[PDB]
Design a protein around this ligand. Structure first.
Ligand SMILES: O=C1c2cc(-c3ccnc(NC4CCOCC4)n3)[nH]c2CCN1Cc1ccccc1
Length: 340
């Protein structure tokens, strides 16, 4: 069958296709799985015309095949031609979810009980990812899927990287890829986004969004983003400026008139007080003082859900993090053999 003028050769195991979502290099559809008797999500990927989408495809497949967690999307099946030459697209079968947090946030008011449960699930998923030495780098509401009982799952590992704190520093205003509204401020100033602290910042942004149903730092352009953050957080202290050695970055910060911190209580007067305290910790301008994932789970805001024993970590971390689209087709092919 075909969806929206796109051929969908996922037969014959899956039938009754329905459109779900779209990607730059692909399309997401719903279908009935005959061999398991339930509805599922199938993701048609055609990345072979670009070396960039291939990296993402490879990255994503390798990670998801290696991860196994309640709060992380899994791969049920991988469909593709039986030969290198015939392989035009690749179909990823996954559990069908009811919605995503992005959609939910535009239509629904979240109760405190919901915010707490969702935050806990994101943290539980995040802890497992960070324990594998992996950075997601693209956490946002659209990448968080929900089912009808409010089980949360993390998806889209295309931009994921192995953590590299040693190689993180960079110059002022260095190009980034991740979604702007969830960019930590150090990305703009001196960071490549090779630390776990970047995911924490995005999750803080997600917390604020769940609190108000609006993005907290909706910057129009790359540097605009910085101003949105500083507008709320206020001018960084001396200690935090001392952490930024690049003169271009430091001098820009010094050139800004002093900005006073806007209290969270003023921004979210209906918010739970324990929630706002955690929000403050996650949205800390200094990455080094920013709360870590395990500490966040231990915060009193989440105490009704906190159980260290029931928050697993990865068995095998990722050891290490130019290939043309050709050799990238070969690997994807090699990584997908399991399912044929
Ligand atoms: O990967 C995805 C993906 C996975 C799902 C998904 C999975 C499970 N279940 C549901 N259910 C949906 C029901 C309706 O409300 C929303 C969730 N969606 N959706 C998307 C849209 C974004 N892309 C990006 C992408 C797509 C193709 C190629 C490259 C990249």
């Amino acid at each position: 069958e075909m969806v929206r003028g796109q051929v969908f050769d996922v037969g014959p195991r899956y039938t009754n296709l329905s459109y779900i979502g779209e990607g730059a290099y692909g399309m997401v559809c719903s279908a009935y799985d005959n061999l398991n008797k339930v509805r599922v999500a199938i993701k048609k990927i055609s990345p072979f015309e670009h070396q960039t989408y291939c990296q993402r495809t490879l990255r994503e497949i390798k990670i998801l095949l290696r991860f196994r967690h309640e709060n992380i999307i899994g791969i049920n099946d991988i469909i593709r031609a039986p030969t290198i030459e015939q392989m035009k697209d690749v179909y990823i079968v996954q559990d069908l979810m009811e919605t995503d947090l992005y959609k939910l946030l535009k239509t629904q008011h979240l109760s405190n009980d919901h915010i707490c449960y969702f935050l806990y699930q994101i943290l539980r998923g995040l802890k497992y990812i960070h324990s594998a030495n992996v950075l997601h780098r693209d956490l946002k509401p659209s990448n968080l899927l929900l089912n009808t009982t409010c089980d949360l799952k993390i998806c889209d590992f295309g931009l994921a990287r192995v953590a590299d704190p040693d190689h993180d520093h960079t110059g002022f205003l260095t190009e980034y890829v991740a979604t702007r509204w969830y960019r930590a401020p150090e990305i703009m100033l001196n960071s490549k986004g090779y630390t776990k602290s970047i995911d924490i910042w995005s999750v803080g942004c997600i917390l604020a969004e769940m609190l108000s149903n609006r993005p907290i730092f909706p910057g129009k352009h790359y540097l605009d983003q910085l101003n949105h953050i500083l507008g709320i957080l206020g001018s960084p202290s001396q200690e935090d400026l001392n952490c930024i050695i690049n003169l271009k970055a430091r001098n820009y910060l010094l050139s800004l008139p002093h900005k006073n911190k806007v209290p969270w209580n003023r921004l979210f007067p209906n918010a739970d007080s324990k929630a706002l305290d955690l929000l403050d910790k996650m949205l800390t301008f200094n990455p080094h003082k920013r709360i870590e994932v395990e500490q966040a789970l231990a915060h009193p805001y989440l105490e009704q859900y906190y159980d260290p024993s029931d928050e697993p970590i990865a068995e095998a971390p990722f050891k290490f993090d130019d290939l043309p689209k050709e050799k990238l087709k070969e690997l994807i092919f090699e990584e997908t053999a399991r399912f044929q």
